[PDB]
């Protein structure tokens, strides 16, 4: 309906704002662009479902997220991918893992603080009706 499309538009505006705040944070620069499979040949060996903050922005604008849970699944994928590709004790790995966990924690904290629970419930009930 028209009222439902307004609901999803508000969700998109919210998700764009959250993702922008993550993308300008200096700690998360390593997650802002896709890994180049040419420059990092072993990445596809480990990671079959790549995700990054620029791809999240593209999916918002293609109307792929109907709930905050769909969005958080891709944030969690950015994080879990980084943990899998950086599993070793060396400091480069440990630095990326720390940033990956910080990215996840920061996204969840913004949403917990700023997304109304009833708005998210509405989004979910519209989604379940389709
Ligand atoms: C995404 C991620 O998790 C990631 N992890 C890394 N870890 C390491 O290099 C660890 C791995 N263990 C051995 C020691 N070195 S590099 C890296 C990464 C991030 C971004 C790019 N970009 C930016 C755009 C062009 C491009 O290709 C490439 C790679
Ligand atoms: C090829 C590649 O790996 C790469 N290419 C880029 N291209 C551009 O920025 C254009 S950035 C980037 C890259 C390399 C290493 C990191 N790492 C290693 C762990 C600490 C850390 O930050 C992050 C990103």
From Swiss-Prot:
Belongs to the AAA ATPase family. May be a transcriptional coactivator of the nuclear receptor ESR1 required to induce the expression of a subset of estradiol target genes, such as CCND1, MYC and E2F1. May play a role in the recruitment or occupancy of CREBBP at some ESR1 target gene promoters. May be required for histone hyperacetylation. Involved in the estrogen-induced cell proliferation and cell cycle progression of breast cancer cells. It is found in: Nucleus. The gene is ATAD2. Highly expressed in estrogen receptor positive breast tumors and in osteosarcoma tumors. Residues 108-130 form a coiled coil. It comes from Homo sapiens. Interacts with ESR1 and NCOA3 and these interactions are enhanced by estradiol. Interacts with acetylated lysine residues on histone H1.4, H2A, H2B and H3 (in vitro). This is ATPase family AAA domain-containing protein 2. Induction: Up-regulated in breast, uterus, colon, ovary, and stomach tumors. Induced in breast cancer cells overexpressing NCOA3 or treated with estrogen. Down-regulated in 5-fluorouracil-resistant derivatives of the colon cancer cell line HCT 116. Residues 3-114 form the Bromo domain. The chain holds residues 981 to 1108 of 1390 of the full protein. It comes from the Eukaryota.
């Amino acid at each position: 309906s028209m009222q439902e499309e307004d609901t999803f538009r508000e969700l998109r505006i919210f998700l764009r704002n959250v993702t922008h705040r993550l993308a300008i944070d200096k700690r998360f620069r390593v997650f802002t662009k896709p890994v180049d499979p040419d420059e990092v040949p072993d990445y596809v060996t480990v990671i079959k479902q790549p995700m990054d903050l620029s791809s999240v922005i593209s999916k918002i604008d293609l109307h792929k997220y109907l709930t905050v849970k769909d969005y958080l699944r891709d944030i969690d994928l950015i994080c879990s991918n980084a943990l899998e590709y950086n599993p070793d004790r060396d400091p480069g790995d440990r630095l990326i893992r720390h940033r990956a966990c910080a990215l996840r924690d920061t996204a969840y904290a913004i949403i917990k603080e700023e997304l109304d629970e009833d708005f998210e419930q509405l989004c979910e009930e519209i989604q379940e009706s389709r």
